[PDB]
Write a protein that binds this ligand. Structure first.
Ligand code: D8F
Length: 309
């Protein structure tokens, strides 16, 4: 069998005990609420921070809600992290990933702006990308409402948010914002299509993210398999910014992350590839229920500090 950490295994056994309906069998509101509840019970509590403020910026469909996290009430110009939550582009919001954002802000000592991007099925592909790109460009412009000056931006996100991370970096690479992407951090991202991958078959059931959920999200979002904004493995990697790709060894979409990191090396780009051993997809948000995942997040943080100099 594949290696599973004991604390990870205990969580998986509890999920199996819970049982219950699939995402597709729930109403959309129920599916979203179930994600809120899982992260509410599984993640470590929020860090206390000097600044936690709701903002918004203009976007192509209307205003995009944002949340700013900063350990400092005032700070000098520097890079700003721009965070896109996971949830298949269907579930998640500013609260499902709130505690993680406070942790990133506390441990990095950099401001974090999370994006409340439009969700499918109500807003299919590419709505999420439109909002993540717009909000990242907005942050990169150092607007007065932000109260911080950005010298560069650092896209980061988990799962669908890691897909968005890569797409945003490619879009800004092609048409720069007011400051560059100085580092991108796609965490267990969807980069290439997982269909047909060995990891999707190996981890299709019993590893938190299921093949059934992947198919549910896909039906809702409707990304075009030939569009690099849906599957950014298809994009131009020759000028990719410095990158940290973090995956999980038990992740059905693990191989998608492997593929992306291999493509960056193939294009001669600087990349840190970290594959956390014995944990699942979503490890960034289960840091109380599976305490060893706090250390996995701390390794990403250390890699980010190193890559930033
Ligand atoms: C209850 C399942 C939680 C998985 C939600 C999540 O952690 O965010 C994801 C985002 C995107 C994809 N995907 O594109 O396959 C999978 C997961």
């Amino acid at each position: 069998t594949p290696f599973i950490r004991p604390d990870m295994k205990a969580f998986l056994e509890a999920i199996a005990a819970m049982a219950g309906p699939t995402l597709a069998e729930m109403t959309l509101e129920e599916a979203r609420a179930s994600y809120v509840a899982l992260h509410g019970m599984a993640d470590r509590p929020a860090r206390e921070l000097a600044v936690i403020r709701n903002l918004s910026c203009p976007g192509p469909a209307g205003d995009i809600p944002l949340r700013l996290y900063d350990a400092r009430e005032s700070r000098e110009a520097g890079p700003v992290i721009t965070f896109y939550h996971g949830g298949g582009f269907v579930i998640g919001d500013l609260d499902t990933h709130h505690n993680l954002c406070t942790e990133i802000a506390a441990l990095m000592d950099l401001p974090v702006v999370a994006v409340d991007y439009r969700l499918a099925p109500e807003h299919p592909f590419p709505a999420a990308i439109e909002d993540c790109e717009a909000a990242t460009r907005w942050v990169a412009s150092s607007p007065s409402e932000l109260g911080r000056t950005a010298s560069g931006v650092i896209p980061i996100g988990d799962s669908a948010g890691g897909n968005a991370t890569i797409v945003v970096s490619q879009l800004l690479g092609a048409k720069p914002a007011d400051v560059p992407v100085v580092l991108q951090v796609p965490i267990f991202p969807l980069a290439s299509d997982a269909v047909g991958s060995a990891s999707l078959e190996a981890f299709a059931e019993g590893f938190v993210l299921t093949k059934a959920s992947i198919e549910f999200f896909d039906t809702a979002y409707k990304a075009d398999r030939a569009d690099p904004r849906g599957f950014p493995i298809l994009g131009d990697h020759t000028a990719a910014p410095p990158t940290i790709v973090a995956t999980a060894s038990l992740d059905p979409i693990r191989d998608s992350g492997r593929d992306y990191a291999k493509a960056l090396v193939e294009a001669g780009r600087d990349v840190v590839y970290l594959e956390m051993e014995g944990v699942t997809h979503g490890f960034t948000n289960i840091r109380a229920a599976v305490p060893s995942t706090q250390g996995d997040l701390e390794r990403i943080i250390a890699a980010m500090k190193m890559m930033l100099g």
